[PDB]
PDB file of C-alpha atoms in Angstrom:
ATOM      1  CA  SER A   1     -24.508 -41.784  11.845  1.00 27.20           C
ATOM      2  CA  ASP A   2     -22.497 -38.529  11.481  1.00 26.88           C
ATOM      3  CA  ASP A   3     -25.829 -36.822  10.617  1.00 26.67           C
ATOM      4  CA  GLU A   4     -27.503 -38.291  13.711  1.00 24.83           C
ATOM      5  CA  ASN A   5     -24.909 -36.422  15.790  1.00 26.40           C
ATOM      6  CA  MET A   6     -25.061 -33.007  14.123  1.00 27.77           C
ATOM      7  CA  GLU A   7     -28.798 -33.173  14.771  1.00 28.60           C
ATOM      8  CA  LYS A   8     -28.217 -33.388  18.511  1.00 27.37           C
ATOM      9  CA  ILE A   9     -25.641 -30.624  18.717  1.00 26.43           C
ATOM     10  CA  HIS A  10     -27.666 -28.101  16.660  1.00 26.67           C
ATOM     11  CA  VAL A  11     -30.746 -28.781  18.816  1.00 27.07           C
ATOM     12  CA  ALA A  12     -28.777 -28.192  21.987  1.00 25.93           C
ATOM     13  CA  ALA A  13     -27.235 -25.012  20.570  1.00 23.85           C
ATOM     14  CA  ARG A  14     -30.692 -23.760  19.706  1.00 23.13           C
ATOM     15  CA  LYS A  15     -31.938 -24.375  23.274  1.00 24.42           C
ATOM     16  CA  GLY A  16     -28.940 -22.854  25.123  1.00 23.26           C
ATOM     17  CA  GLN A  17     -27.892 -26.264  26.421  1.00 20.52           C
ATOM     18  CA  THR A  18     -24.169 -25.568  27.038  1.00 22.48           C
ATOM     19  CA  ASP A  19     -23.935 -28.558  29.339  1.00 24.25           C
ATOM     20  CA  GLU A  20     -25.213 -30.804  26.559  1.00 26.34           C
ATOM     21  CA  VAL A  21     -23.078 -29.217  23.787  1.00 24.38           C
ATOM     22  CA  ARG A  22     -19.884 -29.498  25.867  1.00 22.56           C
ATOM     23  CA  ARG A  23     -20.776 -33.119  26.447  1.00 22.68           C
ATOM     24  CA  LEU A  24     -21.151 -33.822  22.725  1.00 22.24           C
ATOM     25  CA  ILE A  25     -17.831 -32.071  21.950  1.00 23.94           C
ATOM     26  CA  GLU A  26     -15.875 -33.762  24.743  1.00 25.40           C
ATOM     27  CA  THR A  27     -17.104 -37.074  23.302  1.00 26.59           C
ATOM     28  CA  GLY A  28     -15.808 -35.999  19.861  1.00 24.04           C
ATOM     29  CA  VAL A  29     -18.589 -34.466  17.762  1.00 24.44           C
ATOM     30  CA  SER A  30     -16.747 -31.791  15.759  1.00 24.86           C
ATOM     31  CA  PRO A  31     -18.056 -28.318  16.778  1.00 27.07           C
ATOM     32  CA  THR A  32     -18.249 -26.830  13.278  1.00 25.71           C
ATOM     33  CA  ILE A  33     -20.376 -29.635  11.774  1.00 22.05           C
ATOM     34  CA  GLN A  34     -22.800 -28.355   9.118  1.00 21.21           C
ATOM     35  CA  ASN A  35     -26.233 -29.071   7.719  1.00 22.26           C
ATOM     36  CA  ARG A  36     -26.992 -28.847   3.992  1.00 22.14           C
ATOM     37  CA  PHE A  37     -27.276 -24.993   4.227  1.00 20.48           C
ATOM     38  CA  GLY A  38     -23.914 -24.532   5.961  1.00 18.15           C
ATOM     39  CA  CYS A  39     -25.564 -23.804   9.314  1.00 14.68           C
ATOM     40  CA  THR A  40     -23.581 -24.718  12.436  1.00 13.48           C
ATOM     41  CA  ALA A  41     -24.165 -24.689  16.163  1.00 13.68           C
ATOM     42  CA  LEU A  42     -22.629 -21.272  16.547  1.00 14.27           C
ATOM     43  CA  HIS A  43     -24.783 -19.673  13.848  1.00 15.44           C
ATOM     44  CA  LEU A  44     -27.786 -21.030  15.800  1.00 17.11           C
ATOM     45  CA  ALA A  45     -26.530 -19.907  19.190  1.00 16.80           C
ATOM     46  CA  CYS A  46     -26.119 -16.387  17.802  1.00 16.32           C
ATOM     47  CA  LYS A  47     -29.552 -16.324  16.220  1.00 17.52           C
ATOM     48  CA  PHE A  48     -31.242 -17.479  19.421  1.00 16.73           C
ATOM     49  CA  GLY A  49     -29.503 -15.525  22.235  1.00 21.04           C
ATOM     50  CA  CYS A  50     -27.603 -18.259  24.126  1.00 19.65           C
ATOM     51  CA  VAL A  51     -24.794 -16.039  25.455  1.00 19.56           C
ATOM     52  CA  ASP A  52     -23.002 -18.809  27.393  1.00 18.22           C
ATOM     53  CA  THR A  53     -23.296 -21.502  24.685  1.00 17.84           C
ATOM     54  CA  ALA A  54     -21.999 -18.900  22.193  1.00 23.39           C
ATOM     55  CA  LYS A  55     -19.095 -17.954  24.448  1.00 24.81           C
ATOM     56  CA  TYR A  56     -18.212 -21.617  24.670  1.00 24.40           C
ATOM     57  CA  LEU A  57     -18.560 -22.576  20.977  1.00 24.52           C
ATOM     58  CA  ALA A  58     -16.597 -19.440  19.945  1.00 25.99           C
ATOM     59  CA  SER A  59     -13.675 -20.749  21.996  1.00 23.81           C
ATOM     60  CA  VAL A  60     -13.595 -24.223  20.409  1.00 24.92           C
ATOM     61  CA  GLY A  61     -14.057 -23.635  16.668  1.00 21.82           C
ATOM     62  CA  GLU A  62     -13.711 -21.024  13.946  1.00 20.89           C
ATOM     63  CA  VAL A  63     -16.802 -21.328  11.687  1.00 20.59           C
ATOM     64  CA  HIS A  64     -15.691 -21.520   8.010  1.00 18.84           C
ATOM     65  CA  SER A  65     -19.109 -21.694   6.402  1.00 18.41           C
ATOM     66  CA  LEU A  66     -21.804 -19.209   5.564  1.00 17.35           C
ATOM     67  CA  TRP A  67     -25.521 -19.495   6.234  1.00 18.67           C
ATOM     68  CA  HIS A  68     -27.627 -17.534   3.793  1.00 16.80           C
ATOM     69  CA  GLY A  69     -24.301 -15.761   3.183  1.00 15.84           C
ATOM     70  CA  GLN A  70     -23.622 -14.967   6.818  1.00 19.29           C
ATOM     71  CA  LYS A  71     -21.156 -15.763   9.554  1.00 18.56           C
ATOM     72  CA  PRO A  72     -22.174 -16.005  13.254  1.00 18.78           C
ATOM     73  CA  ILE A  73     -20.956 -12.483  14.092  1.00 18.28           C
ATOM     74  CA  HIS A  74     -23.241 -10.991  11.430  1.00 18.91           C
ATOM     75  CA  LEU A  75     -26.318 -12.703  12.883  1.00 18.38           C
ATOM     76  CA  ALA A  76     -25.433 -11.602  16.398  1.00 17.70           C
ATOM     77  CA  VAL A  77     -25.362  -7.980  15.274  1.00 15.46           C
ATOM     78  CA  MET A  78     -28.718  -7.952  13.515  1.00 18.46           C
ATOM     79  CA  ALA A  79     -30.186  -9.551  16.678  1.00 19.30           C
ATOM     80  CA  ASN A  80     -29.135  -6.308  18.463  1.00 17.61           C
ATOM     81  CA  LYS A  81     -28.411  -7.954  21.835  1.00 20.42           C
ATOM     82  CA  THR A  82     -25.050  -6.555  22.894  1.00 14.31           C
ATOM     83  CA  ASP A  83     -23.952  -9.072  25.558  1.00 13.24           C
ATOM     84  CA  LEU A  84     -23.948 -11.838  22.938  1.00  8.69           C
ATOM     85  CA  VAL A  85     -21.467  -9.892  20.837  1.00 10.67           C
ATOM     86  CA  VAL A  86     -19.077  -9.493  23.769  1.00 13.42           C
ATOM     87  CA  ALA A  87     -19.511 -13.227  24.564  1.00 17.86           C
ATOM     88  CA  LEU A  88     -18.653 -14.087  20.969  1.00 19.31           C
ATOM     89  CA  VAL A  89     -15.543 -11.918  21.084  1.00 20.57           C
ATOM     90  CA  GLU A  90     -14.232 -13.274  24.415  1.00 19.20           C
ATOM     91  CA  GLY A  91     -14.869 -16.810  23.179  1.00 19.27           C
ATOM     92  CA  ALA A  92     -12.659 -16.035  20.168  1.00 18.55           C
ATOM     93  CA  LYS A  93     -10.027 -14.210  22.263  1.00 21.81           C
ATOM     94  CA  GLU A  94      -9.425 -17.385  24.353  1.00 22.07           C
ATOM     95  CA  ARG A  95      -8.944 -19.263  21.084  1.00 21.73           C
ATOM     96  CA  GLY A  96      -6.235 -16.893  19.743  1.00 17.58           C
ATOM     97  CA  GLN A  97      -8.062 -14.865  17.069  1.00 17.51           C
ATOM     98  CA  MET A  98      -8.131 -11.132  17.725  1.00 19.28           C
ATOM     99  CA  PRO A  99     -11.310  -9.008  17.665  1.00 21.07           C
ATOM    100  CA  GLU A 100     -10.201  -6.927  14.680  1.00 22.44           C
ATOM    101  CA  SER A 101      -9.753 -10.060  12.583  1.00 26.39           C
ATOM    102  CA  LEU A 102     -13.153 -11.387  13.761  1.00 29.26           C
ATOM    103  CA  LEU A 103     -15.256  -8.213  13.858  1.00 29.29           C
ATOM    104  CA  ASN A 104     -14.178  -6.987  10.390  1.00 29.70           C
ATOM    105  CA  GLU A 105     -15.278 -10.111   8.451  1.00 28.05           C
ATOM    106  CA  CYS A 106     -17.318  -9.550   5.306  1.00 33.03           C
ATOM    107  CA  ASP A 107     -20.558 -11.375   4.454  1.00 35.87           C
ATOM    108  CA  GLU A 108     -21.303 -12.604   0.942  1.00 35.54           C
ATOM    109  CA  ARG A 109     -24.913 -11.426   0.740  1.00 35.49           C
ATOM    110  CA  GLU A 110     -26.215  -9.567  -2.370  1.00 39.42           C
ATOM    111  CA  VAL A 111     -28.755  -6.813  -1.563  1.00 40.23           C
ATOM    112  CA  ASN A 112     -30.873  -4.042  -3.169  1.00 41.03           C
ATOM    113  CA  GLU A 113     -32.192  -2.169  -0.149  1.00 39.47           C
ATOM    114  CA  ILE A 114     -30.349  -1.833   3.142  1.00 42.94           C
ATOM    115  CA  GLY A 115     -32.992  -1.310   5.796  1.00 44.69           C
ATOM    116  CA  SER A 116     -34.585   1.975   4.744  1.00 46.33           C
ATOM    117  CA  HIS A 117     -32.317   2.894   1.814  1.00 45.49           C
ATOM    118  CA  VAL A 118     -31.826   1.684  -1.757  1.00 46.87           C
ATOM    119  CA  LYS A 119     -28.272   0.397  -2.217  1.00 47.43           C
ATOM    120  CA  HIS A 120     -26.914  -2.537  -4.195  1.00 46.09           C
ATOM    121  CA  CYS A 121     -24.211  -4.434  -2.268  1.00 49.72           C
ATOM    122  CA  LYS A 122     -22.665  -7.899  -2.727  1.00 46.97           C
ATOM    123  CA  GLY A 123     -20.792  -8.220   0.592  1.00 50.57           C
ATOM    124  CA  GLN A 124     -20.614  -6.244   3.830  1.00 52.03           C
ATOM    125  CA  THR A 125     -19.183  -6.068   7.330  1.00 52.80           C
ATOM    126  CA  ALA A 126     -21.709  -5.840  10.186  1.00 51.24           C
ATOM    127  CA  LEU A 127     -20.582  -2.300  10.998  1.00 52.43           C
ATOM    128  CA  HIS A 128     -21.909  -1.270   7.509  1.00 55.84           C
ATOM    129  CA  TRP A 129     -25.330  -2.831   8.237  1.00 52.33           C
ATOM    130  CA  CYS A 130     -25.709  -1.095  11.618  1.00 53.06           C
ATOM    131  CA  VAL A 131     -24.999   2.161   9.863  1.00 57.87           C
ATOM    132  CA  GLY A 132     -27.932   1.505   7.491  1.00 58.14           C
ATOM    133  CA  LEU A 133     -30.443   0.149  10.013  1.00 57.69           C
ATOM    134  CA  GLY A 134     -31.327   3.441  11.770  1.00 60.06           C
ATOM    135  CA  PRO A 135     -31.059   4.527  15.432  1.00 61.27           C
ATOM    136  CA  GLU A 136     -32.400   1.299  17.010  1.00 62.89           C
ATOM    137  CA  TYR A 137     -28.794   0.109  16.286  1.00 63.82           C
ATOM    138  CA  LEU A 138     -26.846   3.121  17.636  1.00 62.79           C
ATOM    139  CA  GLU A 139     -26.011   1.266  20.912  1.00 60.14           C
ATOM    140  CA  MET A 140     -24.421  -1.564  18.877  1.00 60.41           C
ATOM    141  CA  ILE A 141     -22.332   0.820  16.776  1.00 57.88           C
ATOM    142  CA  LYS A 142     -20.814   2.111  20.040  1.00 58.75           C
ATOM    143  CA  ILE A 143     -20.007  -1.355  21.372  1.00 58.41           C
ATOM    144  CA  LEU A 144     -18.679  -2.657  18.047  1.00 58.79           C
ATOM    145  CA  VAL A 145     -16.271   0.267  17.747  1.00 56.55           C
ATOM    146  CA  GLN A 146     -14.986  -0.075  21.360  1.00 54.92           C
ATOM    147  CA  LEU A 147     -14.409  -3.793  20.735  1.00 56.97           C
ATOM    148  CA  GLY A 148     -12.164  -3.177  17.720  1.00 59.14           C
ATOM    149  CA  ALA A 149     -14.573  -2.989  14.747  1.00 61.94           C
ATOM    150  CA  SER A 150     -12.922  -0.592  12.302  1.00 62.68           C
ATOM    151  CA  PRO A 151     -14.798   2.453  11.002  1.00 61.22           C
ATOM    152  CA  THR A 152     -12.714   2.055   7.827  1.00 61.08           C
ATOM    153  CA  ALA A 153     -13.384  -1.658   7.198  1.00 61.17           C
ATOM    154  CA  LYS A 154     -13.802  -2.384   3.465  1.00 61.22           C
ATOM    155  CA  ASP A 155     -16.880  -3.996   1.968  1.00 61.65           C
ATOM    156  CA  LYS A 156     -16.611  -5.790  -1.436  1.00 64.70           C
ATOM    157  CA  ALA A 157     -17.124  -2.459  -3.301  1.00 62.66           C
ATOM    158  CA  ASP A 158     -14.181  -0.912  -1.382  1.00 57.90           C
ATOM    159  CA  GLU A 159     -16.397   1.365   0.735  1.00 59.25           C
ATOM    160  CA  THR A 160     -15.894   1.927   4.451  1.00 57.70           C
ATOM    161  CA  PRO A 161     -18.537   2.346   7.133  1.00 61.11           C
ATOM    162  CA  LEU A 162     -17.789   6.090   7.291  1.00 61.81           C
ATOM    163  CA  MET A 163     -18.323   6.314   3.531  1.00 60.38           C
ATOM    164  CA  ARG A 164     -21.593   4.413   4.088  1.00 59.95           C
ATOM    165  CA  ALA A 165     -22.877   6.853   6.754  1.00 57.04           C
ATOM    166  CA  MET A 166     -22.044   9.748   4.457  1.00 57.27           C
ATOM    167  CA  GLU A 167     -23.970   8.134   1.553  1.00 56.43           C
ATOM    168  CA  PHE A 168     -27.051   7.545   3.723  1.00 58.74           C
ATOM    169  CA  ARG A 169     -26.393  10.989   5.287  1.00 56.57           C
ATOM    170  CA  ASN A 170     -26.638   9.461   8.757  1.00 58.23           C
ATOM    171  CA  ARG A 171     -24.804  11.913  11.024  1.00 59.08           C
ATOM    172  CA  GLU A 172     -25.465  10.429  14.502  1.00 58.67           C
ATOM    173  CA  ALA A 173     -23.721   7.271  13.287  1.00 58.79           C
ATOM    174  CA  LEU A 174     -20.735   9.168  11.836  1.00 61.61           C
ATOM    175  CA  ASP A 175     -20.024  11.264  14.933  1.00 59.86           C
ATOM    176  CA  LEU A 176     -20.462   8.310  17.256  1.00 59.29           C
ATOM    177  CA  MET A 177     -17.974   6.297  15.163  1.00 61.24           C
ATOM    178  CA  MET A 178     -15.343   9.050  15.146  1.00 61.33           C
ATOM    179  CA  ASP A 179     -15.841   9.990  18.808  1.00 60.32           C
ATOM    180  CA  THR A 180     -16.146   6.410  20.159  1.00 61.59           C
ATOM    181  CA  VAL A 181     -13.111   5.185  18.170  1.00 64.12           C
ATOM    182  CA  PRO A 182     -10.387   4.429  20.740  1.00 61.81           C
ATOM    183  CA  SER A 183      -7.334   5.288  18.644  1.00 61.11           C
ATOM    184  CA  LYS A 184      -8.117   7.867  15.959  1.00 61.87           C
ATOM    185  CA  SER A 185      -4.863   6.642  14.464  1.00 64.43           C
ATOM    186  CA  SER A 186      -6.524   3.249  13.838  1.00 66.92           C
ATOM    187  CA  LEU A 187      -8.460   4.677  10.876  1.00 66.22           C
ATOM    188  CA  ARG A 188      -7.192   3.940   7.375  1.00 64.92           C
ATOM    189  CA  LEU A 189      -7.850   7.292   5.748  1.00 66.71           C
ATOM    190  CA  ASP A 190      -5.678   6.154   2.823  1.00 63.89           C
ATOM    191  CA  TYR A 191      -8.488   3.838   1.621  1.00 66.09           C
ATOM    192  CA  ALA A 192     -10.311   5.020  -1.511  1.00 62.52           C
ATOM    193  CA  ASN A 193     -13.444   3.692  -3.220  1.00 64.13           C
ATOM    194  CA  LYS A 194     -13.780   2.142  -6.675  1.00 66.53           C
ATOM    195  CA  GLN A 195     -13.350   5.611  -8.311  1.00 65.68           C
ATOM    196  CA  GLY A 196     -10.412   6.700  -6.104  1.00 64.63           C
ATOM    197  CA  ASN A 197     -12.564   8.907  -3.825  1.00 64.42           C
ATOM    198  CA  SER A 198     -11.216   9.426  -0.335  1.00 64.97           C
ATOM    199  CA  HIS A 199     -13.344  10.233   2.680  1.00 66.00           C
ATOM    200  CA  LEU A 200     -12.394  13.887   2.139  1.00 67.24           C
ATOM    201  CA  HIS A 201     -13.529  13.678  -1.473  1.00 67.43           C
ATOM    202  CA  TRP A 202     -16.867  12.567  -0.032  1.00 68.97           C
ATOM    203  CA  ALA A 203     -17.936  15.117   2.592  1.00 69.91           C
ATOM    204  CA  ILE A 204     -17.098  17.911   0.174  1.00 70.92           C
ATOM    205  CA  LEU A 205     -19.430  16.296  -2.420  1.00 72.18           C
ATOM    206  CA  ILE A 206     -21.938  15.732   0.394  1.00 70.10           C
ATOM    207  CA  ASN A 207     -21.580  19.313   1.643  1.00 71.02           C
ATOM    208  CA  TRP A 208     -20.430  18.310   5.119  1.00 70.48           C
ATOM    209  CA  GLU A 209     -17.842  21.084   5.556  1.00 69.80           C
ATOM    210  CA  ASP A 210     -17.237  20.669   9.315  1.00 67.92           C
ATOM    211  CA  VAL A 211     -16.764  16.889   9.152  1.00 71.30           C
ATOM    212  CA  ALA A 212     -14.329  17.576   6.308  1.00 71.74           C
ATOM    213  CA  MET A 213     -12.188  19.651   8.701  1.00 73.14           C
ATOM    214  CA  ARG A 214     -12.010  16.821  11.227  1.00 75.01           C
ATOM    215  CA  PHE A 215     -10.569  14.677   8.491  1.00 76.29           C
ATOM    216  CA  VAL A 216      -7.885  17.300   7.791  1.00 75.13           C
ATOM    217  CA  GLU A 217      -7.023  17.568  11.495  1.00 77.05           C
ATOM    218  CA  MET A 218      -6.785  13.787  11.567  1.00 81.58           C
ATOM    219  CA  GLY A 219      -3.871  14.251   9.160  1.00 81.28           C
ATOM    220  CA  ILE A 220      -5.606  12.805   6.130  1.00 81.34           C
ATOM    221  CA  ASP A 221      -3.488  13.177   3.024  1.00 85.03           C
ATOM    222  CA  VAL A 222      -4.734  16.184   1.047  1.00 84.04           C
ATOM    223  CA  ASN A 223      -2.798  15.211  -2.102  1.00 85.30           C
ATOM    224  CA  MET A 224      -4.803  12.079  -2.927  1.00 85.33           C
ATOM    225  CA  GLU A 225      -6.061  12.312  -6.497  1.00 83.56           C
ATOM    226  CA  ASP A 226      -9.211  10.503  -7.590  1.00 81.88           C
ATOM    227  CA  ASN A 227      -9.337   8.573 -10.885  1.00 83.52           C
ATOM    228  CA  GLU A 228      -9.925  11.855 -12.844  1.00 87.12           C
ATOM    229  CA  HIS A 229      -6.797  13.495 -11.357  1.00 85.30           C
ATOM    230  CA  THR A 230      -8.932  15.520  -8.902  1.00 87.02           C
ATOM    231  CA  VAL A 231      -7.502  16.705  -5.563  1.00 89.02           C
ATOM    232  CA  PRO A 232      -9.686  17.796  -2.593  1.00 87.01           C
ATOM    233  CA  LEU A 233      -8.450  21.393  -3.047  1.00 87.12           C
ATOM    234  CA  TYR A 234     -10.299  21.474  -6.444  1.00 87.94           C
ATOM    235  CA  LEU A 235     -13.446  20.072  -4.858  1.00 87.79           C
ATOM    236  CA  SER A 236     -13.149  22.539  -1.985  1.00 88.16           C
ATOM    237  CA  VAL A 237     -12.930  25.450  -4.383  1.00 90.85           C
ATOM    238  CA  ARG A 238     -15.830  24.005  -6.405  1.00 92.84           C
ATOM    239  CA  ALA A 239     -17.929  23.430  -3.281  1.00 91.36           C
ATOM    240  CA  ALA A 240     -17.339  27.080  -2.275  1.00 92.97           C
ATOM    241  CA  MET A 241     -16.520  26.247   1.365  1.00 92.40           C
ATOM    242  CA  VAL A 242     -14.199  29.051   2.405  1.00 97.17           C
ATOM    243  CA  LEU A 243     -12.633  27.858   5.695  1.00 95.26           C
ATOM    244  CA  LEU A 244     -11.672  24.424   4.291  1.00 91.73           C
ATOM    245  CA  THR A 245     -10.131  26.138   1.261  1.00 96.24           C
ATOM    246  CA  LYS A 246      -7.913  28.456   3.381  1.00 97.44           C
ATOM    247  CA  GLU A 247      -6.624  25.212   4.966  1.00 96.80           C
ATOM    248  CA  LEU A 248      -6.210  23.232   1.742  1.00 98.76           C
ATOM    249  CA  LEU A 249      -4.106  25.953   0.101  1.00 99.64           C
ATOM    250  CA  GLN A 250      -1.959  25.876   3.266  1.00 93.38           C
ATOM    251  CA  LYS A 251      -1.371  22.073   3.086  1.00 94.19           C
ATOM    252  CA  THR A 252      -1.629  21.172  -0.584  1.00 99.56           C
ATOM    253  CA  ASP A 253       1.657  20.454  -2.324  1.00104.54           C
ATOM    254  CA  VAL A 254       2.737  23.225  -4.691  1.00101.39           C
ATOM    255  CA  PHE A 255       3.022  21.162  -7.840  1.00102.29           C
ATOM    256  CA  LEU A 256      -0.763  20.557  -7.673  1.00 96.23           C
ATOM    257  CA  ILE A 257      -1.680  24.244  -7.417  1.00 96.15           C
ATOM    258  CA  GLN A 258       0.461  25.050 -10.483  1.00 93.89           C
ATOM    259  CA  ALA A 259      -1.315  22.258 -12.423  1.00 93.57           C
ATOM    260  CA  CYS A 260      -4.790  23.386 -11.302  1.00 93.27           C
ATOM    261  CA  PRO A 261      -7.079  23.780 -14.308  1.00 94.71           C
ATOM    262  CA  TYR A 262      -9.046  26.831 -13.014  1.00 97.19           C
ATOM    263  CA  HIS A 263      -6.245  29.177 -14.038  1.00 94.16           C
ATOM    264  CA  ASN A 264      -4.146  29.761 -17.148  1.00 95.52           C
ATOM    265  CA  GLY A 265      -0.775  29.752 -15.393  1.00 97.20           C
ATOM    266  CA  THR A 266      -1.444  33.244 -14.067  1.00 96.46           C
ATOM    267  CA  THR A 267      -5.083  34.386 -13.771  1.00 95.04           C
ATOM    268  CA  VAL A 268      -7.999  32.534 -12.212  1.00 96.78           C
ATOM    269  CA  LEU A 269     -10.866  32.089 -14.718  1.00 95.18           C
ATOM    270  CA  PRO A 270     -14.247  31.642 -12.981  1.00 91.88           C
ATOM    271  CA  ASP A 271     -15.881  30.290 -16.192  1.00 96.92           C
ATOM    272  CA  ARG A 272     -13.580  27.278 -15.892  1.00 95.79           C
ATOM    273  CA  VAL A 273     -15.300  26.411 -12.588  1.00 92.54           C
ATOM    274  CA  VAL A 274     -18.066  23.771 -12.455  1.00 92.00           C
ATOM    275  CA  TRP A 275     -19.659  24.640  -9.105  1.00 94.06           C
ATOM    276  CA  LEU A 276     -21.350  21.769  -7.237  1.00 91.43           C
ATOM    277  CA  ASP A 277     -25.153  21.564  -7.097  1.00 91.04           C
ATOM    278  CA  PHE A 278     -25.732  22.569  -3.454  1.00 90.42           C
ATOM    279  CA  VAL A 279     -23.810  25.797  -4.423  1.00 94.14           C
ATOM    280  CA  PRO A 280     -26.091  28.649  -5.633  1.00 92.82           C
ATOM    281  CA  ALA A 281     -26.034  29.265  -9.384  1.00 94.48           C
ATOM    282  CA  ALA A 282     -26.523  33.018  -8.888  1.00 97.18           C
ATOM    283  CA  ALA A 283     -24.034  35.319  -7.132  1.00 99.63           C
ATOM    284  CA  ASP A 284     -22.603  34.554  -3.679  1.00100.21           C
ATOM    285  CA  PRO A 285     -19.754  36.005  -1.656  1.00 97.97           C
ATOM    286  CA  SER A 286     -18.302  32.502  -1.153  1.00 99.55           C
ATOM    287  CA  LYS A 287     -18.044  32.092  -4.912  1.00 97.56           C
ATOM    288  CA  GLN A 288     -16.167  35.379  -5.065  1.00 95.55           C
ATOM    289  CA  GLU A 289     -14.072  34.622  -1.962  1.00 97.24           C
ATOM    290  CA  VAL A 290     -12.675  31.126  -2.760  1.00 97.90           C
ATOM    291  CA  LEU A 291     -11.439  32.370  -6.165  1.00 96.07           C
ATOM    292  CA  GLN A 292      -9.920  35.461  -4.671  1.00 99.45           C
ATOM    293  CA  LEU A 293      -8.031  33.138  -2.219  1.00100.78           C
ATOM    294  CA  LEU A 294      -6.934  30.916  -5.067  1.00 99.65           C
ATOM    295  CA  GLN A 295      -5.617  34.042  -6.823  1.00 99.26           C
ATOM    296  CA  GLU A 296      -3.635  35.100  -3.718  1.00102.04           C
ATOM    297  CA  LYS A 297      -2.025  31.655  -3.422  1.00102.73           C
ATOM    298  CA  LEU A 298      -1.298  31.417  -7.132  1.00105.86           C
ATOM    299  CA  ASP A 299       0.484  34.772  -7.019  1.00104.34           C
ATOM    300  CA  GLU A 300       2.528  33.599  -3.991  1.00103.55           C
ATOM    301  CA  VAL A 301       3.546  30.326  -5.663  1.00101.77           C
ATOM    302  CA  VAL A 302       4.201  31.812  -9.103  1.00100.32           C
ATOM    303  CA  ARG A 303       6.907  34.089  -7.579  1.00 97.86           C
ATOM    304  CA  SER A 304       9.317  31.202  -6.776  1.00 99.32           C
TER     305      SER A 304
END
């Protein structure tokens, strides 16, 4: 009856029979009609290629169901055929939904290993996946980001794709995202993870000093405090990292320098410093230097 019709439309979707799908829909089979697993024609079009069928179905119906936790965009991305993703987007454009809204959807798929890495995640945008799936998916990352996929989209653990590329220390992905990104004022660098870490808080922890500077020159707020009241300046000092520190003293609000816990109101005390692990435990001129700079700035501020 109803189920005898959804059978026809799913078959046609699978076979790239746009003719035959249009025909079913003109005669009043609802486009988004599901099978017991929440699969719909569009899911199937995206799994199987079917650029033109996908383009069409995307224009007629927003899919509101998940198949093995996924929405038709997510399946298009893992298929790694780029024309189908543009199709999907232009289908949805005709219909009134914008690419940002569409491309930044989150799946509801629990995981314990993301391609080659070992991460637990309960929900993810497709830009996060790409970032985990190695360089076979670099070409997609480019296209997704040109289309309007946000390098600061939030997964269900409040992490962004940039944060994700940092964690998996995947540089090619991170540069591509920041260099491909049309705006550069479309990034939400005010987003912080479950422990209040910014992107700048990462990077320092990761020991990516030069990427950290690009964040600063993108006017990221340098006064964002994590859950433990920690401000990037403190991490910069602690990471050694001399050039970043000269710049964080410059830009950091004065109240936060006065309340810094590596001095006693007047002298810098190097024993109060818990250097990060990639920093040598022995002697180092950068260890000397950053604390000498912090002394200079403390003396300047204390005078007012």
